[PDB]
């Protein structure tokens with residue numbers, strides 16, 4: 001709760017005028033991934049997030065670039081990439 | 097002239113009426129895959145954009161598919177033929193009035 | 194909507210009357226024309242609206 | 243339009259210098275940067291709309307077509323003729339342009355080489371104007387004297 | 388020639404090492420390492436050929452001919468040996484942990500990177516940062532920077548460099564930029580920890596989006612964190628030193644507050660029990676004095 | 683050569699530059715004054731005319747009227763005569779605004795960065811000659827006034 005209050009305080013410190021619509025650009029820094037002997041659930045979630053974003057990068061790059069290649073479809077043929085780990089990360093939770 | 101109008105204002109009025117009459121020359125077509133419109137020929141687009149002297153590429157992207165200031169996020173939504181037309185006559189009526 | 198007017202019965206028709214009534218507009222193009230090259234074409238939209 | 247910058251760790255000793263190859267080898271193998279190398283070798287990494295390409299790169303054309311207010315795609319075809327490239331270097335799309343790496347840098351090199359003569363010619367014109375003004379000043383000073 | 392007689396084959400001192408092409412019998416060849424003159428047999432076609440030895444320190448690995456790896460490793464280690472840390476691949480960049488200090492963040496270089504083409508100067512993270520703004524302005528909107536790596540290494544310095552560079556570019560006299568910059572020390576010193584892999588840590592996922600205008604200048608910002616490791620506090624073990632806040636506010640304050648408070652020594656604390664002397668970072672005057680001035 | 687009125691103008695200019703003795707003619711002097719006399723291009727003329735890169739002494743460089751004339755008529759054939767189209771196109775490419783909001787700063791940058799270079803003296807005579815307001819010209823009036831010699 002003290003950390004929450006201090007982060008809200010620094011927010012209000014940076015709470016200058018909030019205009020809307022002009023432009024923006026985002027920057028993200030995730031926590032790292034480590035393999036240590038004794039781990040709780042939170043570090044497992046962090047590692048799952050890292051694997052999730054790596055899969056996001058791979059799928060984004062390959063699948064999306066190839067789908068625009070078909071979308072214009074001037075002169076192109078299907079190419080093989082593979083490297084998909086979505087079934088591995090799906091095992092986290094699905095009550096179905 | 098008798099009312100006290102310089103000739104340049106009359107030329108500007110003629111420019112406005114020329115723009116509103118030339119505005120309807122825009123022709124759109126389907127994208128063959130989705131509801132997105134297609135704009136293959138910008139002849140009339142270039143003429144009219146130069147008539148108001150604004151950036152056509154920004155104008156073209158906005159008119160063909162505008163970005164909505166919905167407040168949630170920044171999103172541009174695909175439109176249809178009827179939406180583009182409705183915008184065309186809305187602009188025409190606003191200009192004339 | 195056939196009703197008896199001043200002179201006689203008249204014939205009406207619904208053709209998206211609400212659409213004509215609201216008369217939507219695009220803010221993006223309206224904001225674009227807020228700043229234009231020619232003075233008069235700006236005057237068509239220089240007023241706050 | 244995301245952009246990525248990766249990082250690698252060279253050792254477990256937590257010191258500086260004298261790294262070990264196989265650790266970073268495994269790191270790059272799992273990261274799959276080699277797949278990005280394959281796609282950059284094969285795939286086309288540049289997409290440009292027709293109009294901005296038409297306006298931005300016109301000095302090298304050296305043939306200013308005056309048929310304004312029409313023929314955007316025809317202007318693109320004329321620029322392709324002005325580029326005299328082999329069929330593999332270009333693949334015109336419905337609304338974008340497909341190229342391969344290296345053509346863009348060549349374009350900026352050509353245009354930066356081209357603009358030099360124009361700017362130095364304008365500079366020489368300004369020098370001539372200043373020379374004429376100075377000569378007129380000296381002449382009027384002499385006649386006043 | 389026609390084989391270079393030094394094609395890379397897998398080794399143990401390095402991942403791959405050269406091989407001398409000689410008499411071959413059914414792909415079985417007893418190649419010798421020209422660097423060692425040790426004839427070793429080989430049957431598998433594990434040839435990793437090289438480009439001719441004239442492309443020293445290739446700016447981008449696209450002029451090559453064979454898509455091998457040992458030559459790639461050779462280029463990477465050549466760049467590493469000379470401090471050229473910002474090598475990049477096709478459409479993205481890769482770095483290695485320097486563990487050293489270089490004066491590459493000079494303001495003159497910042498000015499020299501101001502608005503140039505990608506192929507004009509040697510690659511550097513400031514060049515990407517500056518290219519980002521022009522990329523945002525040339526198209527409609529929505530630029531983004533994403534970075535990702537094993538554990539925490541550089542997961543923070545590059546973001547700091549980006550923030551500093553954008554603050555330098557941010558202009559129209561810099562008090563708001565100074566506040567935005569000093570915000571990171573506050574959260575960092577209030578959030579850093581000590582870990583076996585790195586005594587510099589980050590107990591959360593940090594995200595930020597700058598807010599621009601038509602000119603592209605800062606108007607405001609907002610930061611949202613994600614799941615600080617709450618359990619770190621009570622548990623304690625080797626290198627499991629909880630947080631710098633306690634370790635440097637145990638004594639980093641006036642004696643008057645010591646009398647007012649109920650602070651204890653490194654042994655009297657029932658909760659705290661370890662030797663915190665492996666702290667070669669600073670002398671903890673900064674942590675409270677500079678934090679107070681920043682606040 | 684044309685009729686003798688150009689020779690008379692050359693003689694009166696010869697009287698006009700009488701510093702350090704009227705008799706001896708300096709290539710630095712004649713080039714500049716003849717640029718004032720309707721010869722805009724002078725960059726390549728330092729090497730094309732002299733045929734010698736020896737530009738050491740500004741005091742005694744041997745140029746005489748007798749050989750100064752035929753060289754001038756050979757140069758008078760108008761080796762190159764540019765026209766305003768390329769100039770205005772290059773300025774518009776150089777123009778980052780299209781109307782003339784703030785031109786002085788980048789004009790100074792390009793002039794101090796250009797190969798032939800301009801010292802700041804040219805910078806203060808820039809503000810004169812109708813170029814007083816901050817970008818009052820959209821690169822057509824300045825073209826007309828510079829093309830007046």
Ligand SMILES: Nc1ncnc2c1ncn2[C@@H]1O[C@H](COP(=O)(O)OP(=O)(O)O)[C@@H](O)[C@H]1O
Nearest residue numbers: 487538539540541542543544545585587588589
């Ligand atoms: N780009 C860099 N330049 C210089 N030093 C760095 C860089 N990245 C990391 N370091 C050093 O490595 C340590 C860890 O930093 P970093 O990886 O950014 O944070 P974290 O370890 O929490 O991810 C820091 O103490 C810093 O001195």
Ligand SMILES: [Mg+2]
Nearest residue numbers: 539542588589
């Ligand atoms: Mg970190």
